[model samples]
Target: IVGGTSASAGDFPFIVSISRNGGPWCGGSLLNANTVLTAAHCVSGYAQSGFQIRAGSLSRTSGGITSSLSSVRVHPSYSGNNNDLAILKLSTSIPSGGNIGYARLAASGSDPVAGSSATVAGWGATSEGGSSTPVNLLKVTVPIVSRATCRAQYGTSAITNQMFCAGVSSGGKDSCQGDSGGPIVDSSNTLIGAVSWGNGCARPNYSGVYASVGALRSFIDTYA
Candidate 1:
C-alpha cells in the first residue's frame, strides 16, 4: 500500500483469503454464511477442490476457518469482455462469531460519489514492480474517482458500466499485486467494489479499477 497500516484479524472479518492448492492467491468477502463474493478473474479455470476460502483471519496462514469450495459461479458476462464478478459456494455454512462475520454488500441503487474516501484492505504486494506480500492484512484509505473521471482516464472501451475506479491522482496509495478480489468498502464499511484491474499499482494517473458492486447487485443476489 502507498499509505496504510497493519490491520487486526477482526478488523475485517468478512475479508477472506482465496487460495489455490493450499496457498493464498486472491482476497474475497463473505457475503453470507455459505457464500463468498469475489472477482471472476480470481476463480478462472479452477476446480472446486483446487480452491479454498479462509475466513475470519487477518493472516493468510492462520486464525481462521478454512473450507473447500463446493461450487464456483462466475457472472454470465464475466469472460474478459464484460463484468468481473464471481461467487463461491461453500460446502458448509460459516459461523459468525467475534472474529468471523459477513459483510453487507451495497444496496442495489448505491453509488460511490467522486472524491469520497474509501477503504481497501488485503495482503497484496506492498509495492509495484516488486514482490513483498505481508503476513498480516493491510489497509489503506483512498479516494473514489467518479465514473466520468475514471472513464476519461481509462477510456470508454476499457472501462465498462460494470466497473469503477479509485486512487489518488498523484499516486501515493493503492492496491497492488495479489490483492485482486479484495473488498473496497466505503466510509460505512459497506462493500461497494471488488479489486479488478489497473494499469500498474500506485502509478500516477493509473486509477485502480474495481468491479462495481452496485452494477452487479441483482446478479450477485441471484447466486450469492
Candidate 2:
C-alpha cells in the first residue's frame, strides 16, 4: 500500500495476510469461511505446506488467528501475468467476528467505471524498492484508469482485459512491491481487483495493474 495511511483493525475485516514460512508475503481477502482470494503470482510454484493465512489483525504477524492451507488453486491460464488469480482453501475456517469477515466479490461486468475511485488495502511496502514492509495494514485510494488509456501508456499487449489499472498520473501513490494479491475494492467494499503487476511502483504515467475480479469471476466461482 504505497502512499497510504494506516488502517484500523476493523476497517477491512475481510483482508488477511498470506504468509510463507511464517513471514508475511502478500495480502488476500477472505471469500468465505475457508476460502481466500489472492493473486496467483503470489503463490505460484510454492509449496502449499509452507503457507499460512492469518485473519482478524491489523498487524500482519500478530493479534490474529492463523490457518494452514488445505490446498491452493491457481488459475490455469495464469501465464506470466494473464489471469493472475488464486483461491486458497483453509485447513480451518477463520470464524467471522469483530475483526473477521468475508469479502463480497463484484459480479461480472460490475467493476467500478473508469475514473471512479477505489480503495486498495495491504501490508506492502510504502516505497518503491523499499527493503522493509509495514507491520500494520495500510490503504490508499486510487482512481481507476480506463483500459484503453492504460494500454496507450503501457502498450496494447501489456494491459489485458483480465487486468485493469489504477493510480494517479503523477506517480506518487500506488501499490508497490510486496503488495501482491491484496484487495482493491470499490467504495462499497466489493472486491474488484487483486494487486497483480505493474511497470514500477507509482511511477509517472505508469499505474499499478491488477487482476480484474469482474473478468475472472467465473473462475473464482468455479473453484471458490
Candidate 3:
C-alpha cells in the first residue's frame, strides 16, 4: 500500500493473504472458519485447487495457518469491476485466535457518508509499478468519496451501485496492486468494501474503486 504503515499482529486478524500456484496474488477477509470474502477478479477463471489461503500472519507468504482452497462462488453478475466479489471455502478450517478472527459485514444497504475515514490493509506494492510487495502487512486510512462525486470523476457508467471509491484528492495514500480482494473497513470494524480496481496506486483525482459490501450483502449471505 502506498504511504501506509506496517500493521500490528492483532490489528487485522480477519485479513489473509491469497496465493495462486504458490505465488502471492491477492488478499481476503475471513468470513467464518472456512469462508473467505475476496474480489471476483482475483479468482476469476481460476480453479480452487490452484489457490491457498494464509491467515494469522502479517507476512504475505509465511508464518500462518495455510489451507488449500476447496471451492469458490463468484458472483453471477460480476462483469468488469461491478459485483466484483467472490466467496472462497477452504479445505480445512482456520481456527480463530488472537491473530485470526472473522470479518463482520456492514449492515445491508448501509453506506458511510462521504468524507468518513476508513482503513485498508494488505501486502500490496508500496509504489506504483513496483516489483516488490511488502514483507509485512501495511495499512492506510483514506477518506470515503461519495457515489455522486466518484461517478462524476470516473463517469456514471463506470461507477455502479456495486462499487464505491475512496482516496484523497491529493493522492499518495491508497491501496495498490496485489491489494485486490482485501478489505476496506469502517470505524465499526465492519467490512465496507473490497479492493477491486483503481486508476493507479495513489494518483490524484483518480480514486481507487472497491466492491461495495453493502450493495452485495445478500450475495455473501446466500453463498458464504
Candidate 4:
C-alpha cells in the first residue's frame, strides 16, 4: 500500500505474492486448497507454468510456501478497465495456517461497510517514480469509499459496477504499481476486493479502486 509500513509474517496469512521471472510482480489471495484470486491483468501475457504463487511469507523470496499455477481463468468480460479479475488454479495444495489460510469471499448480496476500515498489503513501489519493490511486505488501512462519491471523484468513466474504491482521498496511503491483484480485506479479514488499478499512487482526490469480490462471487465459486 502507498505510504504503508512493513508487515510481519503471519499477520496476513491470505496475502501472497504473484511472481514472474523469479520475482514478485503482483499480489494475490489464497481462496482455497489450490485456488488463487488476483487481477486479470496481472496474469496477462504469462504462461501458467511460468508463474509461481508464494503464500505464507512476509519476505518475498526468503520464507514462504511456493506453488506453480497450472492454469488461469480471466473473467469473460475482462478488459483491463472492467471485469478485472482472475482465478489461478494451483498444481498443488497450499496448506492453511493461522497467519496464512484460505479467506472466505464476501457474500454476493452485500458490500463491506462504506467508509469502514479495510486493509491492503503488497510488495509494490512506494511511489510513482520509485523503482524499489521491497522484500518486506507492506500494509495500510484505507476507508472504503461509496460508489457515489468514488464515481464523483474519478468521474463515471473510470468507475464501474464491477469495481469498488478504497484509500484516503487526501494524498497518501494506496496500493501502487507492484501491488496489483492484491487483497482488500474488511474489519474481520473478509475478502471483499481485489487490487485492480488507480489514476496515480496516493494522489489527492484519487482512491485506489478494485474489483468487487461480491460482484463476481458466482464466477469465483466455480473454481475455488
Candidate 5:
C-alpha cells in the first residue's frame, strides 16, 4: 500500500539516497537546500566520508543528479537513545525545481497524539521477511497509538519518549527493511518522525518505531 500522494515529480520533489559503502540503500529526507535529515544509526560506525547524499530527485536511478557528502553531524546525545536525528550536508546546493522541494520540520511542541493518521514513504521491502525492492519509492499509512498502548505492546525498554510507534497491531501496512531514516509525516505534510526500528517488518503488535522529532527539536534546529 502507498501513502498520500500530493505533489508528484512534475511538482515538488526531494529525497536523500543513502548507500553503505555502495551496499544496500537507506532512505532520508531533505530538510533544506543543503541539509538532509536522517537517523544517526544509519551513519554510525561508518566513516562519514563514505556515506553519500543524493538529492534533487524523487527517483535515485533516473531522476536527479547525485552529490557527495560534505559533512555529517549526529546529535550529541545520540547514544542509541533520546537523540536519533542527524544532519547531512551536501557538497552543493540543489537548485529549486518543479519536482525538487523540501519537507517542513515539525514545530518545537508539535506532538502527534494517539489515533492520529500519518504517512510513511520509503523504498523498502514490500513485505515482512522479504528481500528489499529495487523500486524507486513505496509508502503506507499507519495510525498513531497511545504511548501506554505502544509501551504495553513493545515493552517500556523499546518504546521510549524519544520514540513513537505506529502501524496495525496485526501484520499489515508498515515500514520494513531498507526504509531506515525515512520520514513519518503528519497530516499537514510536516515531518514528525524518522523511521528507526521494529521487532520485525509489520508483525502483529510490532509497530514501527520512529525517532520523535518533538523530542529533538533543539538538536534539529541547531544543524537544520
Candidate 6:
C-alpha cells in the first residue's frame, strides 16, 4: 500500500473510516468531534440504518473502533454534477490525538486557482485493476487546471461550478477509483477538494476530478 506523504494521521486527527453493508469502503474527514464529512454517494439510497463510522484510525484493520451512525445527511440537490458531498453524524464521540482533529472547511469565497499544488489521500486501489490496499493510506500530488482545459477533456459532462480538475492531461500521478470521498488538501493542509471522478486511473488526456471544497463551503457550513 502507498503511504500518503502529505497529511499523516497526525495532521488530520478526525478522519473516519466508513463501513457499508458490513464492509469498509471509503474514508471521510471529521468536521467536528462528532460529525464527519464524506461523499454523499457513499451513504445515499441505503436503508440508512446499516452504515457505521470508525474514527481515530490509521489502519482499518487494527487502530480505532467503530461507532454507530447517528444520522446521514446528503446535500438536498446533489446530482453527479455536484459530486455529492455528505455528512455522517456519529452516535458517540471519539477521542482526538496526533493527526486526528477536525479539518477546517475551505472558505467559500476562495478558489484554488489553476496550477496550484494540491494533495490527495485514500485507502483505494494502488494500481490499475488492483485490489483495495488494506490500512495504510495512499497519496499523490497534482495541480489544479483551468475550467476551459477541463471542459476540453471532460466534455462538460458534470464539471460544474461545484467541481474542479487536477493532475496532468498527459496522465501522471493522480487519484484513482476507491479514492472517492477522500480529501484533496492544499499546501496549507486545509481541505481544498474531494476526489470525485476521472476518465480512468491516470489515463492520458484525463486527470482526476474533484469536488471543490472551496466552492462547497456554503453547503458544508450549513450542515457543519
lDDT (Cα, tens digit) per residue for candidate 2, span 1-224:
77899997588899999888888699999999999999998998998998988899898888888899999999888998899999999999888888898998989876558889999989888887788888999999999999988999999998888999999998888987778998999978889999999987988899899999999999999988
- List lDDT for all candidates, in order: 0.86, 0.89, 0.91, 0.86, 0.75, 0.73
Give each model a TM-score.
0.95, 0.97, 0.98, 0.95, 0.90, 0.90
List, residue by residue over 103-145, the lDDT tens digit for candidate 3: 9898789876799999999988999988888779999999999
Give, for candidate 4, the lowest lDDT window spanning 10 residues: 44-53
Scored against the true structure, residue 117 in model 2 reaches a CA lDDT of: 92
Instruction: Write the residue-wise lDDT of candidate 1 on 1-224 in tens digits.
Output: 55678996579889998778876688999988999998999887877688888888788888779878888889888977358999889997899997998888888877788899899998888888555678788999999998888878878788887888899999978988778999999999999989899988888898999998998999899997
Expressed as tens digits, the lDDT of each residue in 116-182 for candidate 5 is 9988877677766565565466667899877788889878876777788888877677887777888
- Model 6's alpha-carbon lDDT is 0.73
Give the best candidate by lDDT. Answer: 3
Q: Give candidate 4 misplaced runs (Cα > 4 Å).
A: none
Better model by lDDT, 5 or 6? 5
TM-score of decoy 2: 0.97
TM-score of 5: 0.90
How many clashes would you count in candidate 6? 10
- List, residue by residue over 107-134, the lDDT tens digit for candidate 4: 9867666789999999899898576788
Alpha carbon lDDT of residue 67, candidate 3?
Answer: 89
1 against 6, candidate with superior TM-score: 1
Could you tell me how far off, in angstroms, the CA of residue 119 lies in candidate 1 after the best superposition? 0.4
